[PDB]
Non-structural protein 3 (Venezuelan equine encephalitis virus), 161 residues
Amino acid sequence: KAPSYHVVRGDIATATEGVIINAANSKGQPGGGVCGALYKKFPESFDLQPIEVGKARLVKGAAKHIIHAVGPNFNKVSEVEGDKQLAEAYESIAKIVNDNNYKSVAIPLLSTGIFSGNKDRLTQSLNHLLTALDTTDADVAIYCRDKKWEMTLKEAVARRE
Ligand SMILES: Nc1ncnc2c1ncn2[C@@H]1O[C@H](COP(=O)(O)OP(=O)(O)OC[C@H]2O[C@@H](O)[C@H](O)[C@@H]2O)[C@@H](O)[C@H]1O
């Protein structure tokens, strides 16, 4: 049961993976960031229902199954309680990957944009991603958007191995 990771610099709303993770809000409504991009292309895969922080929910559409996952908002929560919720959030994703036997999945770095509190959280968010998704079988496309985050991302993924 071993997962794979690769990095992709681009708009996650254009991922070829059948299953895309959304960085969602508690309210389940769009959405700047990746959420706004996914709602722009795949409104079907949104239910617009609340989601508990640190939880996730699978919404299925004709084109894409989106796992809407709620990372902490570091504007609102402490660093410690945020690290819990971020782990929590990713773990919830892995749960859904494992329950549905999803084999290939595209995931953004939760809590690194709108919910970052204006701090670089690449490493932090990546670690929690790799830790939960390591419990999956999935080929994971980690999605970023800055060329520098790409290099840093690629380099960390590679270390592991
Ligand atoms: N289209 C995209 N494709 C890939 N990566 C993206 C995209 N848009 C943004 N990103 C990057 O994904 C990371 C996650 O940022 P956000 O999308 O802001 O998610 P998050 O920081 O968890 O904040 C979630 C909050 O934003 C709202 O849109 C959403 O409804 C929730 O309230 C950031 O590094 C950001 O630069």
